Amino acid sequence: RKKREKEQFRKLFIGGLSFETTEESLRNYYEQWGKLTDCVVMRDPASKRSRGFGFVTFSSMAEVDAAMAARPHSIDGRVVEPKRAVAREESGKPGAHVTVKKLFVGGIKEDTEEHHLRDYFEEYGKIDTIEIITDRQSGKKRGFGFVTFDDHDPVDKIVLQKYHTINGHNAEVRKALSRQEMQE
RNA sequence: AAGGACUU
């Protein structure tokens, strides 16, 4: 059980697969960034036709990071779409598979500043913007903000890490989804 | 296109 939990954080969803792509061609491509412990092309039960996506599982979260740092990836003559895998047990939550560049950061109360967030989050990727939300009339800080990156992957890594302490606060960090996006 | 045992 315990291993399985670990490897969930070492797994990439690979979508946009050529219908020619196999486990072997998938494994050949991703082995350039690490040692794979699993690799699967998901297929229709009846037809065995590729569902156009799969998973690869690496030996560490570092090897995942190295693979994602080397996008774009093309395999069997297609640029594919690699994404950190959402666990099956959370893949029915609203918004779970929605890919965004914006992060919601809550639980930061009144003392937390832009620079706190810039600081804490800059190590994860390139930040475009940072907004701390304040009341419209009173300008009282409402205790949350948003960080937008230039790429969705930082956001995926951040949220998957789950626990974050920011300016002495246990923050709630999630994707910042629109109402539309929340219907996915 | 979001997980293999659709493997009683």
Swiss-Prot record:
One of its GO terms (cellular component) is cytoplasm. Keywords: Acetylation, Cytoplasm, Disease variant, Host-virus interaction, Isopeptide bond, Methylation, mRNA processing, mRNA splicing, mRNA transport, Nucleus, Phosphoprotein, Repeat, Ribonucleoprotein, RNA-binding, Secreted, Spliceosome, Transport, Ubl conjugation. It is found in: Nucleus; Nucleus, Nucleoplasm; Cytoplasm; Cytoplasmic granule. The modification Phosphoserine is found at S18, S74, S138, S178. Its main location: nucleus. GO terms for molecular function: DNA polymerase binding; G-rich strand telomeric DNA binding; identical protein binding; miRNA binding; molecular condensate scaffold activity; mRNA 3'-UTR binding; N6-methyladenosine-containing RNA reader activity; RNA binding. The modification Omega-N-methylarginine is found at R27. The modification Phosphothreonine is found at T129, T148, T165. There is a cross-link at K11, K93, K101, K109, K126, K141, K157, K162, K175 (Glycyl lysine isopeptide (Lys-Gly) (interchain with G-Cter in SUMO2)). The modification N6-acetyllysine is found at K157, K162. The modification N6,N6-dimethyllysine is found at K93. GO terms for biological process: DNA geometric change; miRNA transport; mRNA export from nucleus; mRNA processing; mRNA splicing, via spliceosome; mRNA transport; positive regulation of telomere maintenance via telomere lengthening; primary miRNA processing. Sumoylated in exosomes, promoting miRNAs-binding. According to a report, methylation affects subcellular location and promotes nuclear localization. It is linked to Inclusion body myopathy with early-onset Paget disease with or without frontotemporal dementia 2: An autosomal dominant disease characterized by disabling muscle weakness clinically resembling to limb girdle muscular dystrophy, osteolytic bone lesions consistent with Paget disease, and premature frontotemporal dementia. Clinical features show incomplete penetrance. Heterogeneous nuclear ribonucleoprotein (hnRNP) that associates with nascent pre-mRNAs, packaging them into hnRNP particles. The hnRNP particle arrangement on nascent hnRNA is non-random and sequence-dependent and serves to condense and stabilize the transcripts and minimize tangling and knotting. Packaging plays a role in various processes such as transcription, pre-mRNA processing, RNA nuclear export, subcellular location, mRNA translation and stability of mature mRNAs. Forms hnRNP particles with at least 20 other different hnRNP and heterogeneous nuclear RNA in the nucleus. The disordered region, when incubated at high concentration, is able to polymerize into labile, amyloid-like fibers and form cross-beta polymerization structures, probably driving the formation of hydrogels. In contrast to irreversible, pathogenic amyloids, the fibers polymerized from low complexity (LC) regions disassemble upon dilution. A number of evidence suggests that formation of cross-beta structures by LC regions mediate the formation of RNA granules, liquid-like droplets, and hydrogels. Homodimer; dimerization is required for nucleocytoplasmic translocation. Identified in the spliceosome C complex. Identified in a IGF2BP1-dependent mRNP granule complex containing untranslated mRNAs. Interacts with IGF2BP1. Interacts with C9orf72. Interacts with DGCR8. Interacts with TARDBP. Interacts with CKAP5. Interacts with TBK1. Interacts with STING1. Interacts with SRC. Interacts with PPIA/CYPA. Interacts (via C-terminus) with FAM76B; the interaction results in retention of HNRNPA2B1 in the nucleus and inhibition of the NF-kappa-B-mediated inflammatory pathway. This is Heterogeneous nuclear ribonucleoproteins A2/B1. The gene is HNRNPA2B1. The chain holds residues 12 to 195 of 353 of the full protein.
